[PDB]
Structure formats: structure tokens, C-alpha cells
Amino acid sequence: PEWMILEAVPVLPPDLRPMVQVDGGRFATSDLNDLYRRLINRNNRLKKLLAQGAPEIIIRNEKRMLQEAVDALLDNGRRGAPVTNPGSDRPLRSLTDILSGKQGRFRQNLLGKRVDYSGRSVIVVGPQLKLHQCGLPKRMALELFKPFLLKKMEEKGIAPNVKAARRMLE
């Protein structure tokens, strides 16, 4: 049990809290980074406040801020709600709630993966069709079974190779 008190805050990976180029000159970054700064800045200002000299009202005042910040990245909202700046009085997302949102009670809130070889269209009664089968649009079969086709393309004179077969069908 000594570990329940935090003195070393783990930082989530970077590619998991991207910084990306959007459109025109707009940059989009993971909310988490605005909280991390908070922590970092407060933690630093703290150190500098200790070394500069220390009026203790001022050290606790910040030790508090610091604590609040340590909360923020972990879980926002269990106490007070962080907002970057006017535009979105929207709680900055936070680790805790990223994990939760994953599997928590909502209709499937954010539950479900998207498969790579899929497809959907309008259905229509296939009277002659047997139980056994189902009518599938060839045009669909094509990008559905694209890789499977590519090589049989190669197995027959239609195309010399794999990239050939690809541009042949682009």
C-alpha cells in the first residue's frame, strides 16, 4: 500500500496524444497535452518557488494547484472541471475517462471494431437462389476479393504481376 500516493506521474506515449497537421495551418492535438502542460508548468513553478525563497502561504497555494493538475490528467471531473479556453466549455478529455468510454454503459458508447474486408448494400429477394447461396454484386466481389483476384490474375496471362494487376483495375 505505500504506492497509492503519487510522486512520479507516468506520461502516456506521444503518438497516442498526437500533434497533427489538419488543413491550411490548423493543428490538432490530443486534449491530454493541455493538461500535461499544466502539470509540468506547475511542477516547475513549484521548484523555482522553493529555491527562490519560500513564503509558505505561496508554497501550499501551488502545492494545491499541483495536486489538482495531477488529478486532471488522470481523471477530470471527480472534483472541479478543466476547460482549455473559451470556445468549448467542454471538459478536457482525460486518461481515466478515455479508458472508461471504452467499455462503459451507453448504447455501445465507443464499443466496436471496423473490419477490413467488408461491404454493404441494399438487399433484394432472390427467389431462384438456393438456401445454399446468395447473389452478390460482382462489382462488390471485386474490391472484396481484390488480393485474391490479383494473384489469380498473375496465375493467368491477364497481368504480368501484382502491381500490374492493381493498376489494371484502378
Binding site: 502561504i57 497555494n61 494545491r64 472541479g80
Partner: peptide, 12 residues
């Protein structure tokens, strides 16, 4: 409670 008032109370 609400972190502004108790600090204000504190140094004021």
C-alpha cells in the same frame, strides 16, 4: 471547497 475563496480567505 472552492479553491479561490479559501486562498483569498487565507492571505486576505
Amino acid at each position: 471547497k472552492i479553491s479561490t475563496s479559501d486562498p483569498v480567505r487565507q492571505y486576505l
